[PDB]
């Protein structure tokens, strides 16, 4: 429950998300 906590909680959600929705091979 704070400014700094949720919204690395959540970026971190997404930044998971992303590098197996991306993955830059080849």
């Known amino acids: ?3 700094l906590v949720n919204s690395y909680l959540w970026q971190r959600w997404e930044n998971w998300f992303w590098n197996v929705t991306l ?3 080849r």
């Open 23 to 25: 993955r830059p091979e």
């Open 1 to 3: 429950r704070s400014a």
